[PDB]
Amino acid sequence: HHHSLEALSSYQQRNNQQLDQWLNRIPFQTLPLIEAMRYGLLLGGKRARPYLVYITGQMLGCELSDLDTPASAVECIHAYSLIHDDLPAMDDDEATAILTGDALQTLAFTILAEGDLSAAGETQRVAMLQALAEASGAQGMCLGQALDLAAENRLISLEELETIHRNKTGALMRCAIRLGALAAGEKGRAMLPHLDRYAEAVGLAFQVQDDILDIISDKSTYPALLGLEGAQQKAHTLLQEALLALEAIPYNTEHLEEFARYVVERKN
Template sequence: MTSESMSLVDRLAERAAEIESVLDTILTADVGEEEIARPANLLAAMRYGVLNGGKRMRPFLVMETAALLGADRSAAARVGAAIECLHCYSLIHDDLPAMDDDDMRRGQPTVHVAFDEATAILAGDTLLTLAFEIIASPQTQADGERRIELIYELTKASGIGGMAGGQALDLAAETTPPDEAGIIRLQAMKTGALIRYSCEAGAILAGAAASDRERLRRFGEAIGLAFQLADDLLDVTGNADAVGKATGKDAAHGKATLVGLHGEQWAQKQLSGLVQEATQLLEPFGQSAQYLKLAARFIAERDR
């Protein structure tokens, strides 16, 4: 089977296998240069938190946008692995009792349940710093300016104005429900920022033209909105066993969502519009963007 004839499921699996191979190689017991030791329990928790399944959608977006623009495949895989480390750190911390207090993630006990809270905090902390170590390494990208740009954009996507700030707004929303504009802002930060970065990172790696980079950034924003809207819909309609985590949490915690405000039918219509917008943004790239177009639809129509 050629890569051109693969289904999206096959393509996702191929990319996920590449990312997991990189992660498995990085998360070994071998002590790295200028390291003193790698505590076994901490390493085990990190591996448990990262190598426990998942669609690897964010790394997939990095690799596909990088391939679209002719960037080095191994570099894209390493940046994808870094983003997955950062994403999984956020999941480990979000699941803690002080945050969302979840016992199940991807159909398995969460890290703080499988290990303990202190180890889960340290595992998240270490995965966060590891993400930046991977991107900063010359092994990832020889061009120092591109590495700096990748790091700079990731700090914005993951920090106070991005993912972490979005989680803070999400926690605050349990006591003071935001209006519609507030919900959109929260979701664009908590979920959308890292998805947007995943699409833009491929363009940065490729040294792409500003117009292509902006187009992929806007594509990432559209599918980021779709991802969170689909997630909120699954929280209402999904089955916990199929989804791999608890459902019905938003209503139980009194969290305002766009699905809660407008209903399921409205959400489905919005998702359709976001897929159309995302697809149109990719039209200038032609058939080369086929898997990104399929991914946009998959994100909107997923059932887990």
């Protein structure tokens, strides 16, 4: 419902232009894996993460040039994660799907290690890598995918269900925001506590509002554990949590707050 349905289109372009220069570097293009990578990566999605990197950094004074690195990096992790998700093993040139996943995770760090950064950003390059590894491994995206493992058969605690989305979706999204901030150096870093709160609320609400769109277009789902109206009340409460968090930030929180609303107001 917001002007974020078509803003995400402005960036979405840069992110693809950028991720291309990176794929272009790889030798043996005629090779297939470098192909799966190229598809599995330039297909993607709405690129909410890259977008979060961009707007968060800008809000903090960064040029887009100062942000293509984290932006591109974070999308590589996202992309890898989907590819692995769609595996016969998991869901029930496959081996090529496995490899292409593996190579995209690696690519993400190549990017964080090698890409340009403002002088302010440089000071945080190591911090960007620790944050991307932390959000992606057994302490985030992986720990959360491990939890959606056991949960697949059973129906679960609302807590459990949140702890799942928190790690499996929250971590990387909070990461895209942290990256965006770190690109602006210590000034950005000092804003993390508030940005974190924001991220956690927005990451969770994103899931809740899916389920709500699942039910409203005709397991353990937010609507099942709370009922349709009980869930919508949760999403709205989370949008309030986000916005409340952004109020602590002394900068133009316009596009972030706006992104929060889009998460829950979407007809997507």
